[PDB]
């Protein structure tokens, strides 16, 4: 992204209250300019010897404040949705971003590349509920046998479990805390801190380590100022 | 085109269909000088004494 | 400080000149605000500091801002007046620093411009 | 574009008093709105910008409040210092903006 070496901060706003864009964006970028630099380039664009001439290129927004949603999805057995990723409200329709990559978030404040993303109606929504929403094909991923694993979202995981598998969910204090039966069940990143699902764990919740500290003392600079006795001197 | 038109607008979201320009930034530099002091003894007037 | 305003005909031209002290005018964005006789206050024109212009419905075509980073003043070449534009035309920008754009704390002295024959 | 409207045309009240005049914007402008002083003869003097921060160094007994289309704004002590012409703006976007008309306020005393 763009340094802070490229771009201070003042500049940054320097540059943002040029931008030709309403109060309400102008606004946004003044409280994720971590985003916007992950967002931003620098092109190195003219390079004398005396002088240097970069181009920095900031993102501009379309839309804001818009309803944004992320779809997880887990085998039901055996049916997989595929249509996976960052759903936002364009403009009387819903841009559907499916790469994880160009889709940055923070706090509760979605950021999204436009470039590659495609455009479908609000009835996609009506997939979630019945996949055979007859006002809309939902693409979905089939196969003749019995599968079984875990996905693990924002707030929580998604168990499925199928088969003769044994999959469960435990808590760091109280351990196992639930076995699952054959179906889909969900399970809120709250109350579970681990859904193991066979033999393979997954990590509800991220583990917190050792904390290190690396200590540093102040240096001393000294020095010793060479003094000439000239009063004994300049008596004899 | 994007020769004739720089904008265009669907609904409530607008698209930039041509880079905006922008302000120009400019980093002042001014030569840095170094100094020295060069120590001279008066040793002509000390060999005469 | 403003100067440069005064009585001019119906269809001349007139030129205001922004004196501007404290801060530099290449570096952010300037304003003109007008106000007729016992009316409120209108928003007229407005420069940032990237050159970008705008002006109002009611002037647009006919009044141009600019600015000289020379003798440090922003100005407003007002051509085609009638009668409807006779007011007291200020000046304004923002002295402090942020990333909202609008408010204003410093203003001109304030200028009159009459219109008639 | 948008239209801001006050209440009401004007104002009255002592010296001491609690003082709010209403500004209401024909657009949710979010929390940008500038009240604004103007003595007879003056240049406008900014009291509060975005809606509630106050410009450093204005007296305090100066308050905004609100956000959206309902905008007041309260002052707490009256002064002889006061009393003028207060003036609300809405800035929403960069390309356009507009002023209230204006509330006149005088004394009792």
């Known amino acids: 992204p763009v340094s802070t070496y490229m771009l201070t901060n003042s500049e940054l706003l320097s540059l943002i209250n040029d931008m030709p864009i309403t109060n309400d964006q102008k606004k946004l970028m003044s409280n994720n300019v971590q985003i916007v630099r992950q967002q931003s380039y620098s092109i190195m664009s003219i390079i004398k010897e005396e002088v240097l001439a970069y181009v920095v290129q900031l993102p501009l927004y379309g839309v804001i404040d818009t309803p944004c949603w992320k779809l997880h999805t887990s085998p039901l057995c055996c049916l997989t949705r595929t249509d996976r990723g960052w759903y936002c409200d364009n403009a009387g329709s819903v841009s559907f971003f499916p790469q994880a990559e160009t889709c940055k978030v923070q706090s509760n404040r979605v950021f999204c590349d436009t470039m590659n993303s495609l455009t479908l109606p609000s009835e996609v929504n009506l997939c979630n509920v019945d996949i055979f929403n007859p006002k809309y094909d939902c693409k979905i991923m089939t196969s003749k046998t019995d599968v079984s694993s875990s996905v693990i979202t924002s707030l929580g995981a998604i168990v499925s479990c199928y088969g003769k598998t044994k999959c469960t969910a435990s808590n760091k204090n109280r351990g196992i805390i639930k076995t699952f039966s054959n179906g889909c069940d969900y399970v809120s990143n709250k109350g579970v801190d681990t859904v193991s699902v066979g033999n393979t764990l997954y990590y509800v919740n991220k583990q917190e380590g050792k904390s290190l500290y690396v200590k540093g003392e102040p240096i001393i600079n000294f020095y010793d100022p060479l003094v000439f006795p000239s009063d004994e001197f300049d008596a004899s | 085109s994007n020769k004739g038109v720089d904008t265009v607008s669907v609904g409530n979201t607008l698209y930039y269909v041509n880079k905006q320009e922008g302000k120009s930034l400019y980093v002042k530099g001014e030569p840095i000088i170094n100094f020295y002091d060069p120590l001279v003894f008066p040793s002509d007037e000390f060999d005469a004494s | 400080v403003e100067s440069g305003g005064g009585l001019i005909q119906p269809g001349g031209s007139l030129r205001l000149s922004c004196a501007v002290s404290?801060?530099?005018?290449?570096?952010?964005?300037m304003t003109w605000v007008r106000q007729a006789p016992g009316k409120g206050l209108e928003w007229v024109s407005v420069?940032?500091?990237?050159?970008?212009?705008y002006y109002a419905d009611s002037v647009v075509g006919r009044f141009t801002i600019s600015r000289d980073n020379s003798k440090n003043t922003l100005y407003l070449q007002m051509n085609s007046l009638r009668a409807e534009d006779t007011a007291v035309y200020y000046c304004?920008?923002?002295?402090?620093?942020?990333?909202?754009?609008?408010?204003?704390?410093?203003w001109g002295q304030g200028t009159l411009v009459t219109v008639s024959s | 574009d948008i239209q801001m409207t006050q209440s009401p045309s004007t104002l009255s009240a002592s010296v001491g008093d609690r003082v709010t005049i209403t500004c209401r914007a024909s657009?949710?402008?979010?929390?940008?709105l500038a009240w604004y002083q103007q003595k007879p003869g003056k240049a406008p003097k900014l009291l509060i910008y975005?809606?509630?921060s106050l410009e450093s160094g204005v007296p305090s007994r100066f308050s905004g409040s609100g956000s959206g289309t309902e905008f007041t704004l309260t002052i707490s002590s009256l002064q002889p210092d006061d009393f003028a012409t207060y003036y609300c703006?809405?800035?929403?976007?960069?390309?356009?903006?507009?002023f209230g008309q204006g509330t006149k306020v005088d004394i009792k005393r």
């Open positions: 304004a920008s923002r002295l402090g620093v942020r990333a909202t754009t609008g408010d204003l704390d410093y």
């Open positions: 404290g801060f530099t005018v290449s570096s952010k964005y």
């Open positions: 420069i940032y500091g990237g050159g970008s212009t």
């Open positions: 657009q949710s402008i979010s929390s940008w």
């Open positions: 975005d809606a509630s």
């Open positions: 703006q809405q800035y929403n976007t960069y390309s356009w903006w507009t």
